[PDB]
Design an enzyme around this catalytic site. Structure first.
Site, PDB file in Angstrom:
ATOM      1  N   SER A 190       0.787  38.406 127.426  1.00  0.00           N
ATOM      2  CA  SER A 190       1.543  37.777 128.457  1.00  0.00           C
ATOM      3  C   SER A 190       1.027  36.334 128.825  1.00  0.00           C
ATOM      4  CB  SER A 190       1.797  38.699 129.606  1.00  0.00           C
ATOM      5  OG  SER A 190       2.943  38.284 130.515  1.00  0.00           O
TER       6      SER A 190
ATOM      7  N   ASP B  86      11.469  42.782 124.848  1.00  0.00           N
ATOM      8  CA  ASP B  86      10.680  42.456 125.994  1.00  0.00           C
ATOM      9  C   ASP B  86      11.698  41.481 126.788  1.00  0.00           C
ATOM     10  OD1 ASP B  86       9.020  41.411 127.629  1.00  0.00           O
ATOM     11  OD2 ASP B  86       7.459  40.684 126.061  1.00  0.00           O
TER      12      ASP B  86
ATOM     13  N   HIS C 116       8.054  44.501 126.725  1.00  0.00           N
ATOM     14  CA  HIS C 116       6.670  43.945 127.189  1.00  0.00           C
ATOM     15  C   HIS C 116       5.138  44.706 126.875  1.00  0.00           C
ATOM     16  CE1 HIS C 116       4.824  40.718 128.914  1.00  0.00           C
ATOM     17  NE2 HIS C 116       4.145  41.424 129.803  1.00  0.00           N
TER      18      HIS C 116
HETATM   19  C1  LIG Z   1       2.886  38.484 131.808  1.00  0.00           C
HETATM   20  O1  LIG Z   1       1.780  38.150 132.319  1.00  0.00           O
HETATM   21  C2  LIG Z   1       4.097  37.625 132.363  1.00  0.00           C
HETATM   22  C3  LIG Z   1       4.083  36.346 132.132  1.00  0.00           C
HETATM   23  C4  LIG Z   1       3.325  35.803 133.243  1.00  0.00           C
HETATM   24  C5  LIG Z   1       3.475  36.557 134.524  1.00  0.00           C
HETATM   25  N1  LIG Z   1       4.034  37.762 133.793  1.00  0.00           N
HETATM   26  C6  LIG Z   1       4.322  39.006 134.576  1.00  0.00           C
HETATM   27  O2  LIG Z   1       4.481  40.109 133.939  1.00  0.00           O
HETATM   28  C7  LIG Z   1       3.960  39.219 136.034  1.00  0.00           C
HETATM   29  C8  LIG Z   1       2.462  39.138 136.344  1.00  0.00           C
HETATM   30  C9  LIG Z   1       2.480  40.831 136.299  1.00  0.00           C
HETATM   31  C10 LIG Z   1       3.880  41.459 137.050  1.00  0.00           C
HETATM   32  N2  LIG Z   1       4.640  40.241 136.659  1.00  0.00           N
HETATM   33  C11 LIG Z   1       6.011  40.147 136.936  1.00  0.00           C
HETATM   34  O3  LIG Z   1       6.724  39.109 136.521  1.00  0.00           O
HETATM   35  O4  LIG Z   1       6.502  41.161 137.667  1.00  0.00           O
HETATM   36  C12 LIG Z   1       7.895  41.273 138.111  1.00  0.00           C
HETATM   37  C13 LIG Z   1       7.870  40.859 139.442  1.00  0.00           C
HETATM   38  C14 LIG Z   1       8.401  41.771 140.365  1.00  0.00           C
HETATM   39  C15 LIG Z   1       8.548  41.539 141.560  1.00  0.00           C
HETATM   40  C16 LIG Z   1       8.280  40.317 142.066  1.00  0.00           C
HETATM   41  C17 LIG Z   1       8.101  39.292 141.116  1.00  0.00           C
HETATM   42  C18 LIG Z   1       7.940  39.313 139.923  1.00  0.00           C
END
Ligand SMILES: *C(=O)[C@@H]1CCCN1C(=O)[C@@H]1CCCN1C(=O)OCc1ccccc1
EC number: 3.4.21.26
Length: 710
Positions: free
Chosen positions: A554, A641, A680
């Site tokens: 990610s 994903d 994912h």
């Molecule tokens: C993988 O690192 C991806 C791409 C960059 C950020 N990310 C995520 O999955 C981020 C970081 C871990 C959690 N996340 C995410 O998007 O969670 C979803 C979410 C839930 C609630 C509020 C905001 C986002």
């Protein structure tokens, strides 16, 4: 080596967009449509060359066999009490999904409560979130199919594990909180949208709302409790205070550790939960994080980073709410990060700190905040914990690079608190005493000292002859702490490798300052830190460029992809899992809008200027020097994903194959593997996990020509 030809991929040379005067060509923009025959044909053609490449060398079979043997060990979660019963997750070893068990007493016979394995032939339906009613007699659980973030919430009566009719749809990034009267549960849902909502769509997720579901009714009857129509990106999660009197609403916008905190005194509702609640806006801005720990009457204890980047505990009295009146219960530490806090046995607080990327656990008094007991731990991480306010005991799980983990138990009713091993499992085949873990601190470009763990067989000669596997993430306030990985240990033992994990900026290892050091205008610090980690391993003799592999997922996928573009001469192999590659368009899909707090957004001229310099998709360029080519690269993604839409990896590989793959000097393969019925990563069945690591290490083995060591 390369006995395959890269597939023909059409280039839409008319796809030009103006970004604040900067013209950007996106010839593979068409790959953004997952449903087209063109995109489906693209995926099929790529998998067609990748699969035979990975499966040709018998080392993949040797690895897969060793992984299946070694990963086959009992895996337990901490026991936890709900009502009059105890629950715990357990996987006998190779089950696709861990099973939830229940027992009437700590000494009683356990029985299967919820087994996700029988929900699908391939283990692609997984539990994603759950919540028991306050009395522990009812249970709500989320189910995701094929790895998608989408969830369907179902319900059961605990006594007799009876399935109830209640089903909640359109749930995603949801809270799950039961009102203490046992009438219903709060949860989040997204409005109906055109097209699919199964994980294969790219549709942006906006207007999430908070609903209240009354047990025994249809979802169409659910009460809307909070909505933010003028702020499409806001997400409000609910939780009930320990005494059940207040509903606490934590509103987030983006991924920064900050939230508004509103509350609703349920006693003050005119006639129960009937519509939009009488929210009192205690903290009505996004300047700091306020994580509820517990309350005693109107005095609420929160873990916060408000003017305390290493976090601290404060008490806010709802009857005297002004900030100048807040009491600091446990002050911020000079360097150690307060990771999380739990309240147990009424007046005890369990605090978990991160000291130089290693966990520490201690018990404090709720009234004064004074330290009472230190729970001793070896070098590693606390990855599990149980013990709520009404509970009189705690369970906690510890893991490390060389130990599968120990589950400890401590009865808090005893004058003399003495934690005891409750469960422990060792992996036969990996003698932890043959290896050592060392932590070093290396200076990055700007002189900042960055921590790095290195795990290797004892007594190796630092002559640069060892293959190395360097891992990093660097972002979102996520701390990369020690954890047990059979897959990586097989690399050490059976492939003679050295493992390294670099705690680069952007993470939360040194609090919010560490996080801020790797976001927005400073994102390049992450790439510099990681490149310096590689240079340290090389300079110190742990490995050599041609023997070095870098991996990340990610935000870590973005990390390794950028490093390949910026310093192709430094690595021999790169494995990017589910990575964000199109930094100019990431915000347009699913939940990508939430990541702008770490990366910025191309809509802004200032932000575009930072992003264009490192965006993987926009920085693929043939190395200037004739003797330098791109390292071997493998991109791993999946069709469901919906966290990081696969188009990122699709456009990136098309670009790599066209710009670099077509060059005469490029002999190292540039490949992608797109899995089916997966997403994912969360909830991925054991069978798929085994295939994935087998693919990764077979790729490394083939590209670097590493012999298997029996
Ligand atoms: C993988 O690192 C991806 C791409 C960059 C950020 N990310 C995520 O999955 C981020 C970081 C871990 C959690 N996340 C995410 O998007 O969670 C979803 C979410 C839930 C609630 C509020 C905001 C986002």
């Amino acid at each position: 080596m390369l006995s395959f030809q890269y597939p023909d991929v059409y280039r839409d040379e008319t796809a030009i967009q103006d970004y604040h005067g900067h013209k950007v060509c996106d010839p593979y923009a068409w790959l953004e449509d997952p449903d087209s025959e063109q995109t489906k044909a693209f995926v099929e053609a790529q998998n067609k060359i990748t699969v035979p490449f990975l499966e040709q060398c018998p080392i993949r079979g040797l690895y897969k066999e060793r992984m299946t043997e070694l990963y086959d060990y009992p895996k337990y979660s901490c026991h936890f009490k709900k009502g009059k019963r105890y629950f715990y997750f357990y996987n006998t070893g190779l089950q696709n999904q861990r099973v939830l068990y229940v027992q009437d007493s700590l000494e009683g016979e356990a029985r299967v409560f919820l087994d996700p394995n029988i929900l699908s032939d391939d283990g692609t339906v997984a539990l994603r979130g759950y919540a028991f009613s306050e009395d522990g007699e009812y249970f709500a659980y989320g189910l995701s199919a094929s790895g998608s973030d989408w969830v369907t919430i179902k319900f059961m009566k605990v006594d007799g594990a009876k399935e109830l009719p209640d089903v909640l749809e359109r749930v995603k990034f949801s809270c799950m909180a039961w009102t203490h009267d046992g009438k219903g549960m709060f949860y989040n849902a997204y409005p109906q949208q055109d097209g699919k909502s199964d994980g294969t769509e790219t549709s942006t997720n906006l207007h999430q709302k908070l609903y209240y579901h009354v047990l025994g009714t249809d979802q169409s009857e659910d009460i809307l409790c909070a909505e933010f129509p003028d702020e499409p990106k806001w997400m409000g999660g609910a939780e009930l205070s320990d005494d059940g009197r207040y509903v606490l609403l934590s509103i987030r916008e983006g991924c920064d550790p900050v939230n508004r905190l509103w509350y609703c005194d349920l006693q003050q509702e005119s006639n129960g939960i009937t519509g939009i609640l009488k929210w009192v806006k205690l903290i009505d801005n996004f300047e700091g994080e306020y994580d509820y720990v517990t309350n005693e009457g109107t005095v609420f204890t929160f873990k916060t980073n408000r003017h305390s980047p290493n976090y601290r505990l404060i008490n806010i009295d709802f009857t005297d709410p002004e900030e100048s009146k807040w009491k600091v219960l446990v002050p911020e530490h000079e360097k150690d990060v307060l990771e999380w806090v739990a309240c147990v046995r009424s007046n005890f607080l369990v605090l978990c700190y991160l000291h130089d990327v290693k966990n520490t656990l201690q018990l404090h008094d709720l009234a004064t905040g004074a330290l009472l007991k230190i729970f001793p731990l070896e070098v590693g991480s606390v990855v599990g914990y149980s013990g709520q306010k009404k509970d009189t005991e705690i369970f906690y799980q510890f893991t490390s690079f060389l130990s599968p983990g120990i589950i400890y138990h401590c009865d808090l009713t005893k004058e003399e608190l003495e934690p005891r091993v409750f469960r422990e499992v060792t992996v036969k085949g990996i003698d932890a005493s043959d290896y050592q873990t060392v932590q070093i601190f290396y200076p990055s470009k700007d002189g900042t000292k960055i921590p790095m763990f290195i795990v290797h067989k004892k007594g190796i000669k630092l002559d640069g002859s060892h293959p190395a596997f360097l891992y990093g993430f660097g972002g979102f306030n996520i701390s990369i702490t020690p954890n047990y990985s059979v897959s990586r240990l097989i690399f050490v033992r059976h492939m003679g490798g050295v493992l390294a994990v670099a705690n680069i900026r952007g993470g939360g290892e040194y609090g919010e300052t560490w996080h801020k050091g790797g976001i927005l205008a400073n994102k390049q610090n992450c790439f510099d830190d990681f490149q310096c980690a590689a240079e340290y391993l090389i300079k110190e003799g742990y490995t050599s460029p041609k023997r070095l592999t870098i991996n990340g997922g990610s935000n870590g996928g973005l990390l390794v992809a950028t490093c390949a573009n910026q310093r192709p001469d430094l690595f021999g192999c790169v494995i990017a899992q589910v990575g964000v590659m199109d930094m100019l368009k990431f915000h347009k899909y699913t939940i990508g809008h939430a990541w702008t707090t770490d990366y910025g957004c191309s809509d802004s001229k200032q932000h575009f200027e930072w992003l264009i310099k490192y965006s993987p998709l926009h920085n693929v360029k043939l190395p200037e020097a004739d003797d330098i080519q791109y390292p071997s690269m493998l991109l791993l993604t999946a069709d469901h994903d919906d966290r990081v839409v696969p188009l990122h990896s699709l456009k990136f590989i098309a670009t790599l194959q066209y710009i670099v793959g077509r060059s005469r000097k490029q002999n190292n393969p540039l490949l992608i593997h797109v899995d089916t019925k997966a997403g994912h990563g969360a909830g991925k069945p054991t069978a798929k996990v085994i295939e994935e690591v087998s693919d990764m290490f077979a790729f490394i083995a083939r590209c670097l020509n590493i012999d298997w060591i029996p």
